[PDB]
Design a protein around this ligand. Structure first.
Ligand SMILES: *[C@@H]1O[C@H](CO)[C@@H](O[C@@H]2O[C@H](CO)[C@@H](O[C@@H]3O[C@H](CO[C@H]4O[C@H](CO[C@H]5O[C@H](CO)[C@@H](O)[C@H](O)[C@@H]5O)[C@@H](O)[C@H](O[C@H]5O[C@H](CO)[C@@H](O)[C@H](O)[C@@H]5O)[C@@H]4O)[C@@H](O)[C@H](O[C@H]4O[C@H](CO)[C@@H](O)[C@H](O)[C@@H]4O[C@H]4O[C@H](CO)[C@@H](O)[C@H](O)[C@@H]4O[C@H]4O[C@H](CO)[C@@H](O)[C@H](O)[C@@H]4O)[C@@H]3O)[C@H](O)[C@H]2NC(C)=O)[C@H](O)[C@H]1NC(C)=O
Ligand SMILES: *[C@@H]1O[C@H](CO)[C@@H](O[C@@H]2O[C@H](CO)[C@@H](O[C@@H]3O[C@H](CO[C@H]4O[C@H](CO[C@H]5O[C@H](CO)[C@@H](O)[C@H](O)[C@@H]5O)[C@@H](O)[C@H](O[C@H]5O[C@H](CO)[C@@H](O)[C@H](O)[C@@H]5O)[C@@H]4O)[C@@H](O)[C@H](O[C@H]4O[C@H](CO)[C@@H](O)[C@H](O)[C@@H]4O)[C@@H]3O)[C@H](O)[C@H]2NC(C)=O)[C@H](O)[C@H]1NC(C)=O
Ligand SMILES: *[C@@H]1O[C@H](CO)[C@@H](O[C@@H]2O[C@H](CO)[C@@H](O[C@@H]3O[C@H](CO[C@H]4O[C@H](CO[C@H]5O[C@H](CO)[C@@H](O)[C@H](O)[C@@H]5O)[C@@H](O)[C@H](O[C@H]5O[C@H](CO)[C@@H](O)[C@H](O)[C@@H]5O)[C@@H]4O)[C@@H](O)[C@H](O[C@H]4O[C@H](CO)[C@@H](O)[C@H](O)[C@@H]4O)[C@@H]3O)[C@H](O)[C@H]2NC(C)=O)[C@H](O)[C@H]1NC(C)=O
Ligand SMILES: *[C@@H]1O[C@H](CO)[C@@H](O[C@@H]2O[C@H](CO)[C@@H](O[C@@H]3O[C@H](CO[C@H]4O[C@H](CO[C@H]5O[C@H](CO)[C@@H](O)[C@H](O)[C@@H]5O)[C@@H](O)[C@H](O[C@H]5O[C@H](CO)[C@@H](O)[C@H](O)[C@@H]5O)[C@@H]4O)[C@@H](O)[C@H](O[C@H]4O[C@H](CO)[C@@H](O)[C@H](O)[C@@H]4O)[C@@H]3O)[C@H](O)[C@H]2NC(C)=O)[C@H](O)[C@H]1NC(C)=O
Ligand SMILES: *[C@@H]1O[C@H](CO[C@@H]2O[C@@H](C)[C@@H](O)[C@@H](O)[C@@H]2O)[C@@H](O[C@@H]2O[C@H](CO)[C@@H](O[C@@H]3O[C@H](CO[C@H]4O[C@H](CO[C@H]5O[C@H](CO)[C@@H](O)[C@H](O)[C@@H]5O)[C@@H](O)[C@H](O)[C@@H]4O)[C@@H](O)[C@H](O[C@H]4O[C@H](CO)[C@@H](O)[C@H](O)[C@@H]4O)[C@@H]3O)[C@H](O)[C@H]2NC(C)=O)[C@H](O)[C@H]1NC(C)=O
Ligand SMILES: *[C@@H]1O[C@H](CO)[C@@H](O[C@@H]2O[C@H](CO)[C@@H](O)[C@H](O)[C@H]2NC(C)=O)[C@H](O)[C@H]1NC(C)=O
Ligand SMILES: *[C@@H]1O[C@H](CO)[C@@H](O[C@@H]2O[C@H](CO)[C@@H](O)[C@H](O)[C@H]2NC(C)=O)[C@H](O)[C@H]1NC(C)=O
Ligand SMILES: *[C@@H]1O[C@H](CO)[C@@H](O[C@@H]2O[C@H](CO)[C@@H](O)[C@H](O)[C@H]2NC(C)=O)[C@H](O)[C@H]1NC(C)=O
Ligand SMILES: *[C@@H]1O[C@H](CO)[C@@H](O)[C@H](O)[C@H]1NC(C)=O
Ligand SMILES: *[C@@H]1O[C@H](CO)[C@@H](O)[C@H](O)[C@H]1NC(C)=O
Ligand SMILES: *[C@@H]1O[C@H](CO)[C@@H](O)[C@H](O)[C@H]1NC(C)=O
Ligand SMILES: *[C@@H]1O[C@H](CO)[C@@H](O)[C@H](O)[C@H]1NC(C)=O
Ligand SMILES: *[C@@H]1O[C@H](CO)[C@@H](O)[C@H](O)[C@H]1NC(C)=O
Ligand SMILES: *[C@@H]1O[C@H](CO)[C@@H](O)[C@H](O)[C@H]1NC(C)=O
Ligand SMILES: *[C@@H]1O[C@H](CO)[C@@H](O)[C@H](O)[C@H]1NC(C)=O
Ligand SMILES: *[C@@H]1O[C@H](CO)[C@@H](O)[C@H](O)[C@H]1NC(C)=O
Lengths: 471, 119, 136, 136, 136, 53
């Protein structure tokens, strides 16, 4: 009608998709330990004591993981924090010298101290001697250290070795006061932005979400790093979810998200001694002087029955996406040591566990129920000190040994699989999935899959019958 | 978008109970209210009740207050109407009508084909 | 009738959503980004992100306040204007807007004419001031 | 009667301190921090402390200005509202406030109800705009 | 009569330049500096130079807005005041200003009394609020 | 133009440090040179002296 005039409404509930800067927020209780954690440093503002989560009722929003800019932002921040925490630490250039290594010799009895009989570290370490510089540059001293065979590569003149990194890059020694413990990080937004949260229990990555809610900061996200299994994550609400950018494309990694946690219990039974030498002015190098007492390979304990159950529900969901085919699991077919073995961290010691007993089975038709009694699965693990976790992007690190025995207990929350292609043989009613794949980004798509950053647009223009009163 | 379909005709002996279901599809079921009207042959439509498929709130007519109850189902998006103590004069064509808008409709947008019941 | 949270009335029609304008307006500049933040601490990885977050929050607030000043609506939640509605931006009647549409659907419908409407609102306010100087 | 400096009337009662409001209001955003500042010169130790002083001086100004807009008091030194005084925040009479109390003493007395009062003030301005749209 | 661009009417007299105020006013805070900017990307040579520009663009807008608020002219393009013109700042008649001078020439003429005029305008708005509290 | 034909070869001078050097110059070997049209420069040098005068 003629009686309609333009009216300006301030505070309108409207948003649009946007990309912005997210800052950190961490709980104060985990703070004030003076441990100088790498990730959630002192710079994080205190979290909100009373977070607000608002349910938006008649709202359908389009969510799309695999295209979420919060995942790329988190990766940029995680790498950036890693590099700066190592900047003040000590360079290990003097250790790129010729090493003359021999078999290790130890003095103890320690008759296996436990049930497992995986083996002993002897034949897994070498006793190497070399020349370094004292605090005075024109004086040389001969020292010795115990190195894992993974950290030293032979060059020539048998019984003469060198560190692996000495032809790729220089490696810094992690500062002793730095802590690797992942503590939760809350990603927040500037005022004038918001985060949309999808509350659907059974929601794959993409598509409309009919149960959106509004929040201001994400939940506590741990920067835990792993390769084949997601650890210490958040369980699914409804049931197991299989999320893949395209299940038809075999180049895309499949993410499995468990609704029931499975315990993994890893320990390093050996007893290493930390000793320090001076390699230069103000530079001190921490080495494993000796390993006296218990000597046994590192291992992880998995309850056999739980894994078989968890591996049985998962194949149930797989058969839905692959109807008329049998599902089998196989160990990784090759690649770097981070891909072929389960890599994680525990008190600063970096593990590489085999995990071949977990992923070697075939589920033909479930014709009959097969019952077996409880067993414990022992997974041999290897330790490494020269660490390159960012695929040769970040700064290489050397991890000083940790005194004493090491034990860690963590949850298993998901699996990163990789289906393999084929034309004729692979179509003979069989599908093999192998653990591992993707990159570290997929370790955080599993936490940030339910979030979406939007920009608020509080200015509304509407027709009403109110006319401005002219003077 | 949107279309309401009722069930087939029924021939029920007097005194029995009859339930007629109107199925809604191709539109957001919970956004628009549902109304029921009956149109006896050679007569005009009569208003019976209005049911909100969002919060279940219902409105009835006094004469049908103690005889008629309306229920709504969300998962399959179907509206049910049950009537008991079927008098001989209840024979009429029954319609399910969708509201014109989401609030203060003042009109019915879409109807059903009708369900003639004989009593 | 119950009070809503931030964006709690995003899915309700305009007639019911416009009763919660102060909920969204009260959160535009104020947040936990302005805390005390518990090796230059202000140059760390997360010292820079907090800084530019503080500047982001201000610009978003001033981006709306810039228009309110031009249109003469400073200090108003709902501000009436002297610009007649043009039945080319939209010709929906009262019931087809305030009882059948959400603010998100509507702002998408007239999305092509928001820039045109903004210019008209500024020009209208300018004429009122011109017509006042040479009237008193 | 003489003009005071910045905060020169902090010790005087309200009745006399309210005659110097423009002295404090005039120094809220302008200072020597916005000068030209006489090895990136803006990454030095004091290149950063000046940058974060400029952003700080802006948020402090916008924090007060945000509330003035919501309450409909934009562009006013002393603004009257339509919110009746509730005799639970304070039941002192005229002489017991404007002739016996300083602004610092009083703002501490009602410190428990400022947040409640702020929300009431915002809601009151909202009702005025609602009552005006459906009146013209 | 044709529309001008930014500063297109800098050479015209006041009577003609005053009809193009919204052209300059519309460009005071909005610019391409607030884009997404296509080794921390925000610490590079031009990452810093962009951040400083964003803060500068906000201070310049708020510097003018501070004065509009103190004088009671918030949300107006042309604002009338109650301060009589003093024939010591300039004693030129109507035609000698609005038909013979440009805004640049004039602002240089009264440049010695701009600071004095600003203070008076703030003091005048203060009296209006004082005279209104003790009148209602 | 640089008519020569240089070969880029790399040696390792330290851990992670690689030095690119000219291993050899095989094939064409001639001094680098620049070509200017003589007539154009005469004109451009002739107008310039006109303004200088
Ligand atoms: C998935 O999640 C799960 C669960 O969240 C993860 O599993 C958890 O992981 C955390 C961290 O990895 C574990 O916490 C650590 O526990 C150990 C062991 O605690 C026992 O021993 C304590 C005494 O330690 C002494 O003895 C041990 C041998 O037993 C020896 O190895 C050690 O060096 C030391 O000599 C006992 O006190 C403790 O009992 C009780 O202690 C507390 C009271 O004091 C009480 O509150 C506890 O609840 C507990 O009941 C227990 O018997 C701790 O040693 C370790 O402590 C470090 O970290 C904390 C902060 O977390 C810090 O306050 C400590 O000071 C210590 O920090 C040292 O090491 C840091 C590097 O790691 C370094 O940064 C620090 O500066 C400090 O080092 C400095 O001081 C030392 C000397 O102290 C010096 O040598 C250094 O050079 C340097 O100057 C943690 O608290 C959980 O136990 C574990 N939970 C389970 C169930 O397994 C799992 O890892 C996650 N998985 C993944 C993949 O993420
Ligand atoms: C998510 O989406 C859904 C769907 O889109 C949305 O649900 C709507 O919510 C709004 C709330 O804003 C509802 O509108 C209200 O409806 C109230 C109920 O109205 C019905 O009942 C009225 C009689 O009820 C009285 O008597 C009964 C006992 O019989 C008693 O229990 C009640 O408490 C009450 O006292 C009846 O009159 C009314 O009829 C209206 O509507 C029909 C059809 O729409 C129309 O034809 C009529 O002409 C008449 O207009 C209806 O049958 C109602 O009480 C309430 O009214 C108050 O507010 C209005 C606002 O203007 C005032 O004018 C009025 O005086 C009252 O103060 C209001 O109208 C709407 O009905 C819902 N829609 C549906 C389909 O259920 C959610 O809100 C959305 N949620 C979010 C978060 O987005
Ligand atoms: C620090 O703290 C101290 C103490 O808290 C504070 O001192 C107070 O300062 C205020 C200034 O704002 C004083 O208030 C003023 O007092 C003036 C003097 O009042 C006395 O004298 C009056 C008569 O004086 C006239 O005649 C004499 C000659 O006889 C001549 O010298 C004078 O100049 C003047 O012409 C007399 O009427 C007055 O009586 C009042 O007070 C008593 C007791 O309080 C009361 O019972 C009476 O009913 C009457 O109200 C008193 O005896 C006064 O002139 C002045 O009045 C002007 O201002 C008011 C403001 O409303 C106008 O209404 C009025 O018309 C005048 O224009 C004003 O009242 C106050 O007295 C001081 N208190 C004390 C204890 O000394 C400092 O200011 C503080 N400083 C800072 C920086 O914070
Ligand atoms: C750069 O600088 C230059 C110089 O400083 C400046 O040029 C000036 O531009 C302004 C524009 O704002 C000119 O002012 C306008 O002049 C218009 C023409 O006025 C003359 O002609 C009038 C009659 O013309 C009518 O009839 C003819 C046919 O004969 C027809 O073609 C025309 O289109 C028109 O219909 C005549 O009446 C007028 O007389 C006025 O001026 C004389 C002397 O100045 C004075 O003595 C008279 O008393 C009378 O005032 C003149 O001879 C004119 O149409 C136009 O009027 C409109 O605007 C005014 C605004 O107030 C309205 O009041 C009026 O009703 C009309 O709507 C306006 O006056 C000015 O003349 C230019 N100066 C010169 C020297 O050329 C540029 O603008 C500058 N540019 C920039 C970018 O800075
Ligand atoms: C209040 O809002 C509702 C809902 O609005 C809609 O949903 C919300 C959530 C927002 O997204 C809105 O943007 C959106 O519009 C309004 O309800 C709509 O009302 C219109 C008008 O009545 C109606 O359109 C007519 O439907 C008639 C019946 O539908 C049958 O046929 C369709 C065929 O549609 C085909 O084409 C469309 C695209 O054009 C396709 O999407 C669709 O899939 C089909 O391919 C069929 O789909 C149905 O199942 C039904 O069988 C239909 O006959 C009409 O066609 C005639 O239209 C004009 C007359 O208007 C004639 O001149 C033509 O020649 C055609 O013959 C229209 O298509 C919408 O379907 C309703 N939507 C819903 C969800 O109910 C409501 O009107 C509003 N109230 C007001 C304004 O008061
Ligand atoms: C690793 O080899 C070194 C030799 O470089 C061993 O150090 C010596 O061991 C002999 C044998 O007991 C001692 O007599 C010497 O005193 C040790 N020191 C030196 C400087 O020779 C070291 O014991 C070996 N470690 C292990 C675990 O086998
Ligand atoms: C975790 O999810 C699985 C499905 O992946 C759930 O297993 C289903 O449980 C229901 C209830 O007993 C059965 O009816 C289904 O047949 C099961 N599905 C399969 C594939 O076996 C399991 O219950 C969930 N567990 C929890 C704790 O939520
Ligand atoms: C993880 O495994 C270790 C050993 O594999 C468990 O340590 C045992 O704890 C019991 C206490 O119940 C002791 O009696 C044993 O002596 C311990 N074993 C050894 C070798 O010391 C540990 O309890 C396991 N963690 C969890 C959470 O079950
Ligand atoms: C382990 O090593 C430490 C350090 O040398 C030693 O004191 C201890 O006796 C060894 N054995 C055990 C059981 O701790
Ligand atoms: C787990 O299942 C495998 C078959 O894949 C079987 O060989 C093994 O015995 C089972 N273990 C337990 C503890 O049930
Ligand atoms: C599997 O193949 C059979 C025929 O060999 C077919 O009947 C059946 O429908 C197929 N399964 C599915 C889930 O389509
Ligand atoms: C284990 O894996 C091998 C190949 O790696 C496969 O041939 C075998 O069938 C699997 N199962 C068992 C019980 O070995
Ligand atoms: C309405 O807008 C169109 C362009 O959007 C314009 O052409 C038309 O003139 C406008 N209506 C009026 C009455 O000016
Ligand atoms: C005054 O405030 C109190 C809470 O501080 C409240 O309970 C009371 O109702 C208020 N008075 C009035 C008249 O609303
Ligand atoms: C005009 O200004 C001068 C100082 O610039 C001042 O002395 C004079 O009093 C003013 N005029 C009036 C009427 O106050
Ligand atoms: C130039 O050098 C390259 C690289 O050694 C060689 O392959 C080529 O034959 C040489 N001659 C020419 C004409 O390119």
């Amino acid at each position: 009608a003629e009686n309609l005039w333009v009216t300006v409404y301030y505070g309108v509930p409207v948003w649009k998709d946007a990309d912005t800067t997210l800052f950190c927020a961490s709980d104060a209780k985990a703070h004030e330990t003076e441990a100088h954690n790498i990730w959630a440093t002192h710079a994080c503002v205190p979290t909100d004591p009373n977070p607000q989560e608002i349910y938006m009722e008649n709202v359908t929003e389009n969510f799309n993981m695999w295209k979420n800019n919060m995942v790329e932002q988190m990766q940029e921040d995680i790498i950036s924090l890693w590099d700066q925490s190592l900047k003040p630490c000590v360079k290990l250039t003097p250790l790129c010298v010729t090493l003359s290594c021999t078999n290790v010799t130890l003095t103890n009895v320690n008759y296996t101290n436990n049930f497992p009989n995986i083996g002993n570290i002897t034949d897994e370490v070498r006793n190497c001697s070399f020349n370094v510089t004292t605090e005075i540059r024109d004086k040389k001293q001969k020292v010795y250290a115990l190195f894992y065979k993974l950290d030293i590569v032979q060059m020539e003149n048998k019984n003469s070795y060198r560190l692996i990194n000495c032809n790729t890059s220089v490696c810094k020694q992690a500062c002793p006061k730095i802590s690797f413990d992942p503590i939760p990080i809350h990603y927040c937004t500037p005022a004038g932005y918001a985060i949309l949260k999808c509350n659907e229990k059974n929601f794959n990555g993409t598509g409309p979400c009919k149960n959106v809610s509004s929040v201001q900061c994400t939940h506590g996200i741990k920067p835990v790093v792993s390769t084949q299994l997601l650890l210490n994550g958040s369980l699914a609400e409804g049931e197991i979810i299989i999320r893949s950018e395209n299940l038809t494309n075999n180049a895309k990694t499949i993410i499995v998200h468990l609704n029931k946690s499975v315990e993994i219990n890893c320990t390093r039974p050996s007893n290493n001694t930390r000793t320090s030498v001076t390699i230069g002015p103000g530079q001190v190098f921490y080495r494993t002087g000796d390993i006296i007492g218990d000597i046994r390979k590192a291992y992880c304990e998995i309850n056999g029955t739980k894994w078989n159950e968890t591996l049985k529900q998962v194949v149930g969901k797989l058969k839905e996406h692959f109807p008329n085919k049998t599902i089998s699991f196989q160990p990784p077919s090759g690649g770097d040591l981070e891909i072929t073995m389960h890599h994680f961290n525990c008190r600063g010691e970096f593990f590489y566990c085999n995990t071949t007993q977990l992923f070697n089975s075939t589920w033909i038709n479930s014709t009959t129920i097969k019952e077996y009694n409880d067993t414990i699965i022992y997974l041999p693990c290897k330790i490494k000190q020269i660490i390159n976790m960012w695929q040769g992007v970040g700064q290489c690190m050397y991890a000083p040994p940790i005194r004493g025995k090491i034990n860690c207990v963590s949850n298993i929350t998901g699996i990163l699989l990789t289906r393999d292609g084929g034309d004729a043989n692979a179509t003979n009613d069989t599908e093999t999935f192998r653990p591992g794949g993707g990159n570290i980004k997929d370790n955080w798509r599993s936490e940030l899959y339910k979030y979406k950053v939007v920009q608020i647009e509080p200015l509304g223009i509407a027709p009403t019958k109110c006319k401005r009163r002219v003077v | 978008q949107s279309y309401l379909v009722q069930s087939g005709p029924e021939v029920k002996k007097p005194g029995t109970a009859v339930k007629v279901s109107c199925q809604a599809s191709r539109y957001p079921f919970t956004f628009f209210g549902i109304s029921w009207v009956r149109q006896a042959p050679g007569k005009g439509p009569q208003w019976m009740g209005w049911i909100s498929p969002y919060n279940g709130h219902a409105i009835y007519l006094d004469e049908l207050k103690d005889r008629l109850t309306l229920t709504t189902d969300t998962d399959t998006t179907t509206a049910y109407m049950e009537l008991r103590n079927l008098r001989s004069a209840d024979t009429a064509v029954y319609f399910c009508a969708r509201d014109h808008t989401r609030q203060d409709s003042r009109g019915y947008d879409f109807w059903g084909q009708g369900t003639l019941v004989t009593v | 009738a119950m009070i809503f949270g931030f964006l709690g009335a995003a899915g309700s029609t305009m007639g019911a959503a416009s009763n919660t304008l102060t909920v969204q307006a009260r959160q535009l500049l104020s947040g936990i980004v302005q805390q005390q933040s518990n090796h230059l601490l202000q140059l760390t990885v997360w010292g820079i992100k907090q800084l530019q977050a503080r500047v982001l929050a201000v610009e978003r607030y001033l981006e709306v306040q810039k228009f309110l000043g031009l249109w003469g609506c400073s200090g108003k939640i709902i501000c009436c204007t002297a610009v007649p509605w043009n039945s080319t931006w939209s010709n929906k009647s009262f019931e087809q807007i305030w009882n059948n549409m959400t603010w998100i659907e509507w702002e998408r419908e007239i999305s092509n004419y928001t820039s045109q409407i903004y210019d008209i609102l500024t020009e209208s306010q300018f004429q009122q001031d011109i017509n006042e100087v040479d009237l008193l």
